Write a protein that binds this DNA or RNA. Structure first.
Ligand SMILES: [K+]
Ligand SMILES: [K+]
Ligand SMILES: [K+]
Ligand SMILES: [Mg+2]
Ligand SMILES: [Mg+2]
Ligand SMILES: [Mg+2]
Ligand SMILES: [Mg+2]
Ligand SMILES: [Mg+2]
Ligand SMILES: [Mg+2]
Ligand SMILES: [Mg+2]
Ligand SMILES: [Mg+2]
Ligand SMILES: [Mg+2]
Ligand code: NA
Ligand code: NA
Ligand code: NA
Lengths: 101, 152, 144, 66, 71, 105, 142, 183
RNA sequence: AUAGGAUAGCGCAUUCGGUCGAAUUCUUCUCUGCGGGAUUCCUUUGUAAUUGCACAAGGUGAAAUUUUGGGCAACAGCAGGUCUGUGAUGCUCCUCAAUGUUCUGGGCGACACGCGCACUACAAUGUCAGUGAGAACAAGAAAAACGAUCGAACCUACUUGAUCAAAAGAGUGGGGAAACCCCGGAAUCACAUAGACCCACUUGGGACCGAGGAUUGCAAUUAUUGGUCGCGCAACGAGGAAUGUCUCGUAGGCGCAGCUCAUCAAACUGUGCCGAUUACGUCCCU
């Protein structure tokens, strides 16, 4: 029974300080792992004018938000997986449990 | 010399010959056989609303059906929306910028119906249009004829 | 049985990536996206892809089947990407299955004709900037 | 009708807008000729480099130094 | 325009003073020494320091250089 | 705004009423004479094509139109016929352009 | 076409009371008459069964009579309803295809009809203004 | 098995040369199959002088907004131009091109403070020859039954002979006539 | 070949993303978090040096000089713009037939005219009608509402409509988005298409206007927007004096997406595609 581990966050450093921990805890659990895949980084772009009144040279503000996503597929039961995931993550990182068929 | 086999090479298939020659030779074969169904609407209607004039070739439906069959050979499971992209063009909108418009799927629907009646196309399982075994055999055999330079 | 002799190379003109699979076969056969060399249009782009053969000679492609799959880019950048993948494939095959005196004469012949036959062009599209219609040109200015 | 001159050295861009270059040229003539190995200073329009050849078609004038 | 700013020149003069014995006439081996004997946020500056330390060493082999004091 | 000094409403109104038409034609133009080119072959013109057009070193639909005072559409049609009967040979060919020349001997 | 010019070739052809250039190809000389366009003239040649590759000056007297009948009553020759320029006349209610002086006469009727009821479109036409909701500022100006 | 390239597989570069002693180092007769090469010829100041002369001719046909960026089209126009050139002159069209370039630009010009005659550098003579020939053919074919390759071939053939029927030669004669008067 | 040229092949012959077939192997292309890599590093009987700081050509190289393109950007100011972004605000004005707030209708679009910035052109290096090969950045659906935790809004593919125009209208399935769209069939482009036109305000150019029909919306008249047939006899055949932007994947050309968006891009913000001429300077003008 394959369980899918989806990790996504705004922070590049925090998004893989949990995947490394999830990878390590499962290696201590001896469960076969399909390696953490780095899904494409999606950038949210918002381009607005700098001015609040429409005066002067029309200068613009490019704002970007990057999303980092990883997935780990492991052949482990629900109870064993819950042991792997039962630890404190950092703020701004959410981990999703999914069962594949 | 020009039609001789290169050497250690036998026969031909689709994509091995010129796409225009295959389509021209297929349309000639469709007209000579006479079994293909040609709608009456093709005598007045335009191939697409992106075009501003009706087709100038009296055998434009025969060419379109041959072109559709080759398209189904290259991309099995293709529908009328997919073929509309292949046969689309850029429309003149007057004093306003030109934009790409896909071909009308009506003529492509008629063309797929005519080829289905001929037994050359099978509605693919789980969506799309696919060639039949007779259609695949017809495509390669005609491609060999073009390479041989028979040309009907 | 006979061991399989096969290599893979790529070309990188603009956004076009062409991956050529060169293998030992009974008869020479080079196809780009399934289209043979003699069927590639226009004749000017066909002559460019054929340059990956004629600079060294047809004798070096004698028993090689090359399947170039080109994706991305446009018709011209796909031709320059494909002709580089073919030329790099012959060098890679001769490096793997031939001595070094060969494939060094071949490499010199390729580079003496066109450096871009073996080395990818670094040029890439320059981004558009605001207040500009493209990379360089600015908005029209009226002083009265 | 025209005599070929070889640019010996570039003496600098001449005048405003820098479109004219002052050069020193050596007249390319056969040995023993009156023009053999003789040198004049000339004004050149266009991009010029050392060891560049010009057809002078008149070798009597000399450009004023600048 | 490839002038070494005073941050690169001062740091490369400090490295020669402190690790003269370990340095050499080549960029690549010197750059390896600069990598672990320096703390910097930028690899480019470490690359420019390694380029100028080698320039100092080639200058030192020909004679004394102002700003370098080797006891 | 650049409000003009001492400009009236009557001055305004008289300005727009006189601003219609008048100033134009900033180019010389230099008009040309019309080209009277026949759209179909006459007996004497068709005779020239079958005899005079061969043994021309360079043959082109636009050249033949300039000689026989005919349209290029039918000038090209006659040239395609002269090739069918091997009187002229085709040296360069494309969809838009054809070049012919006379045969040897 | 490599066909000799007939002795009856005419440079100007009369059809529905308008001069038609005989040097032009038939589908492109038939559009010289009002109410017949490029798309309609090709349909007339097909209904008349004549070759579109011929010049208009080679049309015979009976051929001109045939193409004039199809122009006058296209729906009689199996030309569909949607191909016509008066599908439901606001006065008579009958589908037709105007041609030659009928296009101009019916257009004058249309404007006179709108003017009499004093509709907004009629008022714009009377004043010589744009009627399709266009900004007339900085436009026209002859 | 390697073979020397021929332009459009028809015209041989062997024996190609410039009659002028000048422009010998600024006209490239390097063998090629097609005018289309994708090289960074503008990176160095005189690197464009190493571009094959037929490609420099092709680049000169990509003018105006409707011709900008059309190099495959310009190569096809040159394919027919060389065939027409061969019929007109019965020589190598590659050689006729080289002779047309060598004669197409004035040797002396005037500039500028008072107007004075100045010599023209060899790089500018090749640039102006390609520019004036393509410009003269472009305007000749603008509203004309004559095709573009036919107008371009007639221009190159006249410039190769030095005849005043060529736009480049007619322009060259007036530039030198003024330059002589400004000595 | 109905005339059929040029262009690779000379232990096992090629194809078949619907043949929606299995097994095995792997990371050549693709995804990416940290790294590496380039710095005047190397060489001139070069410039300069008479210490140096450097410079120019070439080399190495994917990249050779702020590597390329951006972001950030001091201190002093301007009576520059914004009190029409805010529950940012002092003073002052109106305050129950109100300058508050709703609702109906109109207006913001109104045209003798002048100006800025775009779009489309004036054609044959073309317009039509076919056929081929072919990108990249991106966007996609809903509540403490409403129905029985999902399910409907959002985007699409396939089929149908179709026993006969387009635009439509329907049914089914998929997609919370590297999963469906999607093997993303963009347009420039190409075609030896043996296609039509043939120099003319013309099959260039579509302004303007007429009649039918469909869709968005509570509402289409002052045409909302498509699609069909007509008008095209509206100028326009390259633009006076003047004047803008630009140095290489650049200008110019060509589309595509997002954004405004119930409906509506001649806009902007990005994106890729085809791709040059000229200069490698100067202080004449600003
Ligand atoms: K700033
Ligand atoms: K400040
Ligand atoms: K502006
Ligand atoms: Mg257009
Ligand atoms: Mg348009
Ligand atoms: Mg446009
Ligand atoms: Mg870009
Ligand atoms: Mg200050
Ligand atoms: Mg209100
Ligand atoms: Mg307003
Ligand atoms: Mg309507
Ligand atoms: Mg706006
Ligand atoms: Na012309
Ligand atoms: Na206030
Ligand atoms: Na100045």
């Amino acid at each position: 029974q394959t369980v899918r581990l989806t990790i996504t966050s705004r922070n590049a450093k925090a998004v893989e300080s949990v995947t490394s921990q999830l990878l390590t805890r499962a290696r201590d659990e001896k469960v076969t792992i399909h390696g953490p895949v780095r899904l494409p980084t999606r950038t949210l772009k918002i381009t607005t004018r700098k001015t609040p009144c429409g005066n002067g040279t029309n200068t613009w503000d490019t704002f970007e938000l990057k999303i980092y996503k990883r997935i780990i597929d492991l052949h482990a039961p629900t109870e064993q997986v819950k042991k792997i995931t039962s630890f404190t993550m950092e703020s701004g990182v959410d981990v999703s449990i999914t069962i594949l068929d | 010399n020009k039609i001789h086999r290169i050497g250690k090479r036998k026969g031909a298939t689709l994509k091995d010959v010129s796409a225009w020659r295959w389509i021209k030779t297929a349309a000639r074969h469709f007209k000579q056989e006479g079994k293909i169904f040609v709608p009456n609407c093709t005598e007045i209607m335009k191939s697409s609303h992106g075009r501003e004039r009706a087709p100038q070739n009296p055998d434009w439906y025969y060419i379109r059906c041959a072109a559709v069959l080759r398209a189904i050979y290259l991309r099995p499971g293709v529908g009328y929306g997919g073929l509309s992209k292949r046969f689309g063009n850029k429309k003149n909108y007057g004093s306003r910028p030109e934009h790409t418009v896909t071909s009308s799927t009506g003529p492509l629907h008629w063309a797929c119906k005519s080829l289905t009646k001929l037994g050359l196309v099978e509605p693919g399982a789980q969506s799309g249009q696919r060639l039949t075994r007779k259609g695949h055999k017809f495509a390669d055999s005609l491609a060999f004829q073009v390479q041989i330079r028979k040309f009907g | 049985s006979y061991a399989l002799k096969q290599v893979q190379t790529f070309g990188k003109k603009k956004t076009a990536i062409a991956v050529a699979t060169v293998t030992k076969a009974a008869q020479c056969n080079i196809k780009v996206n399934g289209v043979p060399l003699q069927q590639i249009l226009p004749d000017t782009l066909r002559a460019k892809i054929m340059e990956a053969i004629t600079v060294v000679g047809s004798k070096y492609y004698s028993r090689l089947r090359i399947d170039v799959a080109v994706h991305g880019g446009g018709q011209v950048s796909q031709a320059y990407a494909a002709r580089q993948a073919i030329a790099k494939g012959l060098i890679a095959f001769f490096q793997k299955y031939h001595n070094e005196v060969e494939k060094a004469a071949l490499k010199d012949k390729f580079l003496a004709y066109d450096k871009f036959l073996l080395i990818a062009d670094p040029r890439r599209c320059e981004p558009k900037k605001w207040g500009r219609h493209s990379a360089r040109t600015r908005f029209t200015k009226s002083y009265r | 009708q025209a005599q070929v001159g070889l640019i010996i050295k570039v003496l600098g861009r001449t005048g405003s807008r820098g479109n004219v270059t002052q050069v020193r040229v050596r007249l390319m003539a056969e040995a023993g000729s009156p023009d053999y190995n003789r040198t004049i200073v000339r004004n050149v329009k266009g991009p010029c480099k050392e060891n560049d050849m010009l057809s002078l078609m008149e070798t009597e004038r000399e450009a004023r130094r600048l | 325009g490839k002038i070494r700013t005073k941050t690169v020149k001062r740091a490369s003069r400090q490295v020669v003073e402190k690790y003269y014995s370990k340095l050499n006439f080549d960029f690549y081996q010197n750059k390896r020494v600069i990598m672990d004997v320096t703390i910097a946020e930028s690899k480019k500056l470490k690359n420019k320091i390694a380029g100028y330390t080698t320039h100092i060493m080639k200058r030192l082999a020909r004679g004394p250089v102002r700003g370098i004091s080797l006891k | 705004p650049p409000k003009a000094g001492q400009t009236k409403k009557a001055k305004m109104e008289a300005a727009n009423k006189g601003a219609k038409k008048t100033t134009k034609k900033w180019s010389k133009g230099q008009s040309r004479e019309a080209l009277q080119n026949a759209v179909m072959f006459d007996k004497e013109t068709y005779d020239k094509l079958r005899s005079e057009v061969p043994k021309y070193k360079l043959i082109t639909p636009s050249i033949i139109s300039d000689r026989l005072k005919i349209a290029v559409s039918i000038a090209a049609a006659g040239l395609k016929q002269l090739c069918r009967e091997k009187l002229i040979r085709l040296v360069s060919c494309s969809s838009k352009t054809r070049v012919y020349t006379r045969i040897v001997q | 076409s490599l066909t000799l010019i007939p002795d009856h070739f005419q440079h100007i052809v009369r059809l529905l009371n308008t001069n038609v250039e005989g040097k032009r190809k038939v589908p492109f000389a038939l559009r010289m008459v009002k109410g017949v366009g490029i798309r309609f003239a090709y349909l007339v040649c097909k209904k008349a069964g004549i070759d579109v590759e011929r010049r208009a000056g080679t049309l015979t007297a009976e051929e001109l009579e045939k193409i004039a009948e199809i122009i006058a009553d296209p729906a009689k020759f199996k030309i569909p309803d949607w191909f016509l320029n008066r599908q439901r006349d606001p006065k008579t209610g009958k589908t037709e295809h105007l041609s030659s002086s009928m296009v101009d006469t019916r257009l004058r009727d249309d404007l006179e009809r709108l003017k009499k009821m004093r509709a907004h479109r009629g008022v714009r036409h009377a004043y010589g203004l744009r009627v399709r909701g266009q900004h007339t500022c900085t436009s026209g100006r002859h | 098995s390697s073979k020397t390239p021929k332009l459009f597989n028809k015209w041989s570069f062997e024996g190609l040369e410039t009659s002028e002693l000048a422009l010998r180092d600024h006209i490239s007769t390097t063998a090629a199959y097609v005018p289309h090469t994708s090289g960074r010829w503008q990176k160095r100041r005189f690197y464009k002088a190493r571009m094959p002369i037929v490609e420099r001719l092709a680049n000169g046909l990509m003018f105006k907004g409707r011709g900008n960026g059309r190099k495959l089209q310009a190569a096809r126009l040159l394919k027919h131009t060389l065939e027409i050139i061969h019929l007109l002159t019965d020589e190598n069209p590659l050689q006729v091109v080289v002779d047309a370039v060598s004669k197409g630009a004035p040797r002396e010009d005037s500039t500028r403070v008072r107007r004075q005659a100045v010599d023209v550098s060899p790089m500018r003579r090749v640039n102006e020859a390609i520019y004036q020939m393509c410009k003269g053919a472009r305007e000749a074919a603008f509203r004309n039954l004559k095709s573009m390759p036919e107008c371009l071939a007639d221009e190159i053939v006249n410039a190769s002979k030095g005849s005043s029927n060529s736009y480049a030669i007619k322009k060259k004669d007036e530039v030198e006539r003024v330059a002589k008067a400004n000595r």
